[PDB]
């Protein structure tokens, strides 16, 4: 029913690092949610946990219940651009891309009667090889 048992004298430090972690996590979680608003909370948290392990390695997987260390890692992924390039941002972008693709497919499949009204416009701003694939298939 409680998360942990703390000491009074050192509570300042603990709650500082914990709040810092939670705020950074909120930032990245908001980005994930905007990439795919149809995800739930467990899914989002699981994505973050898996990405941390996958990038850092399984030996470093214990570095999760350590507010200082994980806050620093999250900050590095959120504050640095044109550089490390923030691999987490790339995974978020993957989510966003697939989500909009699913919306497109869902709308056309639920309503075939519009399929041929949009088919033209999405085959205009494409490379000629892409047009060749459209014609060929």
């Amino acid at each position: 029913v409680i998360s942990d048992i703390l000491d009074w004298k050192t509570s300042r430090t603990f709650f500082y690092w914990r709040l810092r972690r939670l705020l950074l996590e909120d930032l990245v979680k908001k980005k994930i949610h905007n990439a795919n608003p149809e995800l739930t909370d467990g899914q989002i948290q699981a994505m973050l946990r898996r990405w941390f392990v996958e990038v850092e390695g399984t030996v470093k997987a214990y570095v999760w219940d350590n507010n200082k260390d994980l806050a620093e890692w999250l900050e590095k992924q959120l504050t640095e651009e044109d550089g490390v390039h923030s691999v987490i941002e790339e995974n978020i972008k993957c989510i966003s891309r697939d989500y909009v693709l699913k919306q497109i497919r869902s709308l056309v499949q639920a309503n075939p009667e519009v399929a041929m009204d949009s088919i033209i416009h999405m085959t205009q701003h494409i490379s000629p090889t892409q047009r060749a694939e459209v014609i060929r298939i």
Binding site: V1, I2, S3, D4, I5, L6, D7, W8, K9, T10, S11, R12, T13, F15, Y16, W17, R18, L19, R20, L22, L23, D26, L27, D41
Partner: protein, 728 residues
Amino acid sequence: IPCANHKMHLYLGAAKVEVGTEVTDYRFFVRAIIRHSDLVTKEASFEYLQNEGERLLLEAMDELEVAFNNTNVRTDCNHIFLNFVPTVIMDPSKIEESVRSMVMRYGSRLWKLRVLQAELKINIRAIPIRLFLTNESGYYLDISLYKEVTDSRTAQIMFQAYGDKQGPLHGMLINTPYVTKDLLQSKRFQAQSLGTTYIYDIPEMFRQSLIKLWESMSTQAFLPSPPLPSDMLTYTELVLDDQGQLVHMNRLPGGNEIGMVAWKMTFKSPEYPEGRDIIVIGNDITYRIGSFGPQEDLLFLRASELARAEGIPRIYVSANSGARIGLAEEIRHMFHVAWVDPEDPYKGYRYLYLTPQDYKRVSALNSVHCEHVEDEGESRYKITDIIGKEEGIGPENLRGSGMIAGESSLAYNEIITISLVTCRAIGIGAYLVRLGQRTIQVENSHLILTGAGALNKVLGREVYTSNNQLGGIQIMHNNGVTHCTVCDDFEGVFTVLHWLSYMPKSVHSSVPLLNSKDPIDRIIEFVPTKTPYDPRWMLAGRPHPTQKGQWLSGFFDYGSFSEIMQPWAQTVVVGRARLGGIPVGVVAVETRTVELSIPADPANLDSEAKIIQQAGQVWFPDSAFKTYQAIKDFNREGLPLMVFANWRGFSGGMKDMYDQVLKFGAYIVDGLRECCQPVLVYIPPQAELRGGSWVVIDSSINPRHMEMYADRESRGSVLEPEGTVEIK
């Protein structure tokens, strides 16, 4: 005017006017001569300048006090001129410092005596210098310095300043006469005569307050070098076009044609030294006394719309008289009474009517609706409805008022809303304050719905004397309406800025973090005990009781804690603070017993005042409702919550059950379920949670954001040990 010590020659001057307009500008002038031999300075003239400055200033104020009270002409801009005969060797900057300090320390008396301008003539070494002081609204003193330069083509002499801040009199003739007030004056004067600041002085206050802010926060965080005052605040006035849309306009102050003014302000603060935006809206108390009209309502609405569209705070400065009313004067001087008995009017009248001569002059205006009748052998137009040709006095002001009320209700749920009460608010004005739910109230101001005079008329006797009995601080601050009280308008502006330093710049921004001067890695030196204690000691810290210096540190950053709604529901403490430079909302629990004083209504002579003892570690209706208000307000503000939970349960007595403790306990749950920020509950040492007090803050309510932690000296269960042994 004769006076004692007639080296202080006093004159009363009345502006010269034509045979038309009367005289309204009356001013006192103190013209003094200071005779003394020349000084040789060996760094030994400082005492002379300081002592003579103080002595002459005090004598000037005293003589002016006497002559000011001996007459009734209602002067505005009194002036003091001190001509010093002797020459002194001194750097002019040092003279500036001396005069500055002397004026500031006695600035209150000069304000009361309406001394706004002052001049001092003194020779250096010899070159004359002339110090020119302007002392308007009592937060800022302006000192200028000029030399008299004769290098001209004619026999005329002119002022030349020192390049840095040349000022208005640069290149001006030294014999320029004194003018007879201006655009801003005679409106600024009225506003100050009501005990409130003039609207177009509000921007300046902000600037000066920001300076104080950058100083005040220098002991809390590692701040960069502040910019110069000219780069701390820039604003544009928001006006209405002919269509009802907003225009960003730069114009001179005092050009408002309606009673409402607004600005978009961009300023640099310690937490956001790149610029943050706010919208400021204010009532002009001098324009058709207070009085929301339709155009004032429209401007309020459009500015609030702007604030929501950008997601930035809205500041409202309330000085108004409620909805605008009026009467159709074009009919008041035309109507005739149709008497039942024209010779004995005390047997009633049947109707009011217009004659054809009057009806023909108004029927084309749609100002009145009448029907033609024949009565007493006369052609009459019996009045059935009056419309009024003048717009802004009719029921259109009800709609408009309601309109803006709705806007405020929306704004609170999207942006930050802060209200400052400087003069008074009546009716709709009060609601507009309340719907912001963040109220600062100046001393000697009131929020009412009905005036004392109206209530006395209704009740039939002189029940109430002052409107402060109805809506003053002693009511509004103790019942939870006003969050903070301030002494004047300037402190109010400062408080607004202070609160803003804890919260995001916009609804789309994160919480501002500071580089704190209080280390995060320290320990807490104050330990909560088993006996009653002030909850502030653990939050902020206390003076070390053993010694004279030495502060015992608390949980939060030193000096960052600011309490709100202090005297209301004193069993719970709420406020804002910073943890390692991270702003947080704070909830804490009083463990000492407190005394609630309930006043007696003077309208019910059979009522009595009461003192009620309220124990600590208990939720009462008032403290529960306060907690709900804090939670909801901080959720909208955008801050995480740090809760120091030490409640032994809710009050179950008859009187708290009758006073709806259960309802407010439910409201707590509904508040926590809508949190979007982290909520961290911590049970301090020698603290306990029992039964009902747990189930309303349990992390299961909002599992995504809520967490609970306990100390080793904590307890938590359904029932205390005594209640358990009595059963099992």
